Every structure is written in C-alpha cells, then in structure tokens.
PDB file of C-alpha atoms in Angstrom:
ATOM      1  CA  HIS C   1      11.273  -7.941 -22.854  1.00 50.60           C
ATOM      2  CA  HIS C   2      14.076 -10.325 -21.495  1.00 50.65           C
ATOM      3  CA  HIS C   3      15.242 -10.168 -17.818  1.00 49.13           C
ATOM      4  CA  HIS C   4      15.709  -6.331 -18.263  1.00 48.92           C
ATOM      5  CA  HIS C   5      18.529  -6.482 -15.610  1.00 47.19           C
ATOM      6  CA  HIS C   6      16.910  -8.421 -12.692  1.00 47.20           C
ATOM      7  CA  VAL C   7      17.201  -6.685  -9.273  1.00 49.90           C
ATOM      8  CA  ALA C   8      17.011  -8.216  -5.750  1.00 51.42           C
ATOM      9  CA  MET C   9      14.538  -6.944  -3.088  1.00 50.17           C
ATOM     10  CA  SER C  10      12.071  -5.623  -5.708  1.00 48.06           C
ATOM     11  CA  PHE C  11       8.475  -4.993  -4.475  1.00 46.71           C
ATOM     12  CA  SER C  12       7.146  -7.244  -7.294  1.00 48.50           C
ATOM     13  CA  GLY C  13       4.571 -10.001  -6.642  1.00 48.55           C
ATOM     14  CA  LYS C  14       1.077 -10.717  -5.239  1.00 50.80           C
ATOM     15  CA  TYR C  15       0.282 -10.774  -1.478  1.00 54.82           C
ATOM     16  CA  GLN C  16      -2.912 -11.707   0.472  1.00 55.74           C
ATOM     17  CA  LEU C  17      -3.948  -9.867   3.682  1.00 54.18           C
ATOM     18  CA  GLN C  18      -2.977 -11.909   6.783  1.00 56.22           C
ATOM     19  CA  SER C  19      -4.090  -9.400   9.472  1.00 56.28           C
ATOM     20  CA  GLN C  20      -4.483  -5.678  10.346  1.00 56.94           C
ATOM     21  CA  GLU C  21      -4.538  -3.489  13.520  1.00 55.21           C
ATOM     22  CA  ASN C  22      -6.501  -0.247  14.290  1.00 56.84           C
ATOM     23  CA  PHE C  23      -8.504  -0.852  11.043  1.00 58.03           C
ATOM     24  CA  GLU C  24     -11.882   0.358  12.401  1.00 58.02           C
ATOM     25  CA  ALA C  25     -10.291   3.522  13.917  1.00 56.26           C
ATOM     26  CA  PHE C  26      -8.373   4.349  10.676  1.00 57.71           C
ATOM     27  CA  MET C  27     -11.145   3.571   8.137  1.00 57.50           C
ATOM     28  CA  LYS C  28     -13.421   5.842  10.277  1.00 56.79           C
ATOM     29  CA  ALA C  29     -10.657   8.555  10.487  1.00 57.48           C
ATOM     30  CA  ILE C  30     -10.563   8.848   6.639  1.00 57.19           C
ATOM     31  CA  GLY C  31     -14.423   8.903   6.554  1.00 59.36           C
ATOM     32  CA  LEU C  32     -15.455   5.594   4.836  1.00 60.40           C
ATOM     33  CA  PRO C  33     -19.112   4.593   5.658  1.00 61.60           C
ATOM     34  CA  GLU C  34     -19.477   2.546   8.889  1.00 63.48           C
ATOM     35  CA  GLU C  35     -21.080  -0.446   7.034  1.00 65.98           C
ATOM     36  CA  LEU C  36     -18.027  -0.735   4.681  1.00 66.17           C
ATOM     37  CA  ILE C  37     -15.774  -0.668   7.810  1.00 67.54           C
ATOM     38  CA  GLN C  38     -17.683  -3.362   9.825  1.00 67.60           C
ATOM     39  CA  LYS C  39     -18.017  -5.700   6.777  1.00 67.90           C
ATOM     40  CA  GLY C  40     -14.637  -4.766   5.135  1.00 69.89           C
ATOM     41  CA  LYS C  41     -12.683  -5.939   8.266  1.00 70.62           C
ATOM     42  CA  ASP C  42     -13.883  -9.559   7.599  1.00 69.03           C
ATOM     43  CA  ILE C  43     -13.593  -9.284   3.761  1.00 66.06           C
ATOM     44  CA  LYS C  44     -10.195 -10.891   2.997  1.00 66.85           C
ATOM     45  CA  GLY C  45      -8.173  -8.419   0.893  1.00 64.74           C
ATOM     46  CA  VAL C  46      -5.274  -8.774  -1.578  1.00 65.31           C
ATOM     47  CA  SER C  47      -2.481  -6.396  -2.701  1.00 67.84           C
ATOM     48  CA  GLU C  48      -0.375  -6.620  -5.894  1.00 69.91           C
ATOM     49  CA  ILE C  49       2.741  -4.425  -6.145  1.00 70.93           C
ATOM     50  CA  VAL C  50       5.055  -4.003  -9.194  1.00 70.11           C
ATOM     51  CA  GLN C  51       8.445  -2.227  -8.984  1.00 69.64           C
ATOM     52  CA  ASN C  52       9.630  -1.311 -12.529  1.00 67.81           C
ATOM     53  CA  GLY C  53      12.934   0.466 -11.729  1.00 66.66           C
ATOM     54  CA  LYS C  54      12.019   3.873 -10.209  1.00 67.63           C
ATOM     55  CA  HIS C  55       8.318   3.283 -11.164  1.00 65.52           C
ATOM     56  CA  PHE C  56       5.917   1.566  -8.706  1.00 67.15           C
ATOM     57  CA  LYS C  57       2.400   0.207  -9.115  1.00 66.09           C
ATOM     58  CA  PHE C  58       0.362  -0.454  -5.947  1.00 63.43           C
ATOM     59  CA  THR C  59      -2.915  -2.350  -6.510  1.00 63.73           C
ATOM     60  CA  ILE C  60      -5.186  -3.084  -3.493  1.00 63.22           C
ATOM     61  CA  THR C  61      -8.531  -4.976  -3.627  1.00 66.74           C
ATOM     62  CA  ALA C  62     -10.901  -5.324  -0.613  1.00 62.99           C
ATOM     63  CA  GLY C  63     -14.632  -4.774   0.157  1.00 63.84           C
ATOM     64  CA  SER C  64     -15.499  -5.757  -3.512  1.00 66.83           C
ATOM     65  CA  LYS C  65     -13.753  -2.564  -4.824  1.00 69.55           C
ATOM     66  CA  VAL C  66     -10.316  -2.091  -6.456  1.00 69.61           C
ATOM     67  CA  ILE C  67      -7.793   0.763  -6.028  1.00 70.80           C
ATOM     68  CA  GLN C  68      -4.838   1.198  -8.441  1.00 66.63           C
ATOM     69  CA  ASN C  69      -1.967   3.645  -7.865  1.00 67.29           C
ATOM     70  CA  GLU C  70       1.022   4.614  -9.989  1.00 69.93           C
ATOM     71  CA  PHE C  71       4.033   6.627  -8.803  1.00 67.74           C
ATOM     72  CA  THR C  72       7.780   7.020  -9.404  1.00 68.34           C
ATOM     73  CA  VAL C  73      10.219   7.440  -6.456  1.00 66.63           C
ATOM     74  CA  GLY C  74      12.163  10.748  -6.361  1.00 65.46           C
ATOM     75  CA  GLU C  75       9.331  12.262  -8.560  1.00 69.85           C
ATOM     76  CA  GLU C  76       5.932  13.778  -7.583  1.00 71.48           C
ATOM     77  CA  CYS C  77       2.867  11.658  -8.562  1.00 72.13           C
ATOM     78  CA  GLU C  78      -0.875  11.630  -7.715  1.00 72.96           C
ATOM     79  CA  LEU C  79      -1.829   8.893  -5.179  1.00 73.62           C
ATOM     80  CA  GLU C  80      -5.466   7.716  -4.879  1.00 75.12           C
ATOM     81  CA  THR C  81      -6.984   6.655  -1.511  1.00 75.27           C
ATOM     82  CA  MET C  82      -9.870   4.412  -0.249  1.00 75.28           C
ATOM     83  CA  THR C  83     -12.240   7.473  -0.186  1.00 73.40           C
ATOM     84  CA  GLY C  84     -11.459   8.131  -3.924  1.00 70.83           C
ATOM     85  CA  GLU C  85      -9.479  11.433  -3.408  1.00 66.40           C
ATOM     86  CA  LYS C  86      -6.255  11.881  -5.413  1.00 67.16           C
ATOM     87  CA  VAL C  87      -3.461  14.160  -4.092  1.00 61.53           C
ATOM     88  CA  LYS C  88       0.042  14.975  -5.428  1.00 62.42           C
ATOM     89  CA  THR C  89       2.958  13.742  -3.292  1.00 64.38           C
ATOM     90  CA  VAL C  90       6.614  12.654  -3.622  1.00 61.21           C
ATOM     91  CA  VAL C  91       7.512   9.063  -2.615  1.00 59.05           C
ATOM     92  CA  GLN C  92      10.914   8.125  -1.108  1.00 59.33           C
ATOM     93  CA  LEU C  93      12.832   4.815  -0.864  1.00 60.24           C
ATOM     94  CA  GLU C  94      15.542   3.719   1.631  1.00 61.05           C
ATOM     95  CA  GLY C  95      18.356   1.114   1.219  1.00 60.03           C
ATOM     96  CA  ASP C  96      16.552  -1.262   3.710  1.00 58.75           C
ATOM     97  CA  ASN C  97      13.692  -2.395   1.322  1.00 55.82           C
ATOM     98  CA  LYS C  98      11.428   0.463   2.615  1.00 57.67           C
ATOM     99  CA  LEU C  99       9.102   3.030   0.954  1.00 59.69           C
ATOM    100  CA  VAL C 100       7.705   6.238   2.555  1.00 59.26           C
ATOM    101  CA  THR C 101       4.900   8.532   1.224  1.00 60.97           C
ATOM    102  CA  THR C 102       2.730  11.194   2.956  1.00 61.16           C
ATOM    103  CA  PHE C 103      -0.782  12.070   1.636  1.00 61.54           C
ATOM    104  CA  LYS C 104      -3.713  13.949   3.364  1.00 60.69           C
ATOM    105  CA  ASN C 105      -1.620  13.821   6.647  1.00 60.18           C
ATOM    106  CA  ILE C 106      -1.593   9.950   6.321  1.00 59.25           C
ATOM    107  CA  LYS C 107       2.120   9.078   6.883  1.00 59.29           C
ATOM    108  CA  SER C 108       2.362   5.742   4.989  1.00 60.52           C
ATOM    109  CA  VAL C 109       5.443   3.509   5.372  1.00 61.71           C
ATOM    110  CA  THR C 110       5.866   0.129   3.574  1.00 63.64           C
ATOM    111  CA  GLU C 111       8.562  -2.578   3.998  1.00 64.81           C
ATOM    112  CA  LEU C 112       9.392  -5.689   1.927  1.00 64.34           C
ATOM    113  CA  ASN C 113      10.873  -8.506   4.070  1.00 65.99           C
ATOM    114  CA  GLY C 114      11.665 -11.589   1.930  1.00 66.81           C
ATOM    115  CA  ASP C 115       8.162 -12.762   0.857  1.00 67.93           C
ATOM    116  CA  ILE C 116       6.295 -10.649   3.499  1.00 70.70           C
ATOM    117  CA  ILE C 117       4.881  -7.089   3.098  1.00 66.49           C
ATOM    118  CA  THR C 118       4.524  -4.919   6.222  1.00 65.42           C
ATOM    119  CA  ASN C 119       2.528  -1.637   5.983  1.00 65.45           C
ATOM    120  CA  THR C 120       1.917   1.143   8.545  1.00 66.43           C
ATOM    121  CA  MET C 121      -0.056   4.430   8.172  1.00 62.45           C
ATOM    122  CA  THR C 122       0.043   7.163  10.865  1.00 63.70           C
ATOM    123  CA  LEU C 123      -2.717   9.849  10.674  1.00 65.03           C
ATOM    124  CA  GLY C 124      -2.801  12.308  13.632  1.00 63.39           C
ATOM    125  CA  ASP C 125      -2.763   9.838  16.582  1.00 63.31           C
ATOM    126  CA  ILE C 126      -4.214   6.764  14.708  1.00 62.04           C
ATOM    127  CA  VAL C 127      -1.390   4.231  14.091  1.00 60.69           C
ATOM    128  CA  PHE C 128      -2.885   1.871  11.452  1.00 63.10           C
ATOM    129  CA  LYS C 129      -0.895  -1.306  10.723  1.00 60.50           C
ATOM    130  CA  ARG C 130      -1.179  -3.996   8.022  1.00 57.70           C
ATOM    131  CA  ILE C 131       0.369  -7.447   7.437  1.00 58.46           C
ATOM    132  CA  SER C 132       0.404  -9.277   4.049  1.00 62.20           C
ATOM    133  CA  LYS C 133       2.264 -12.400   2.757  1.00 62.61           C
ATOM    134  CA  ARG C 134       3.083 -13.794  -0.746  1.00 61.50           C
ATOM    135  CA  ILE C 135       0.533 -15.996  -2.600  1.00 62.54           C
TER     136      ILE C 135
END
C-alpha cells in the first residue's frame, strides 16, 4: 500500500521490556493473582505498537498471555486491561510524541523518545512506571 505518506515520530515498531518500577504494588492494585505478579516481574515482556494515522494498536505480551488493544485518538474506543475488563474511554495525543488515556481510574501516559518507549500509569496513589526499547 506504498509509503501512504510517511510521518516522523510515529509509535510504530516492536519494543522489549528493559525495566519497570512499582510493578508489584500496581499489579496487586488492579487485582491480578499474587503468583502471576511474583513470576510475571521476572518474565521478560514485549510490546508492539502501530500508529496508522489517528488509529493506534497497542499489543503487550508478558506472563505467557497476550493483550491487544485498538483505539483512535480524538474518538472513544474500548480499552482492554491485564484483568480482562474492557471500558470505553477517549485517548488524547500531544505535539511532544505523547499519548494520554484514563481507564478504571488508571491514568496512563505514554511517550515515544527516538527508539525508546516510556510508560507511566497512576492509579490512586500507586505511580507505576515502565521502560521499553526498540528490538
């Protein structure tokens, strides 16, 4: 389907988990089983994001399970979580390579930075944080 007008700073590629902070507090705060927390911290995860204009895929694989999400920025779309719940929410984008979406009181923020993907999720007082890099 050609180059389809190539755009710079697109969230398009594949990224392995480097590290993560407040994982055990956050994965407990959403209510995943304590075995899947204590093993899933050492299971090396991967994410695979695809910006297609206003459309966005967000794939995440960790703990031997896969999550796929689809949304479109400026529109309302149903985002799936680690617990398997789906909730409707609007996603926003800023002119600094950032995304923002809020689901189940989990205030997710993402940022593309060259080849590196930063993620943060703030639920109540738990400030979860995530670091991934291009593979």
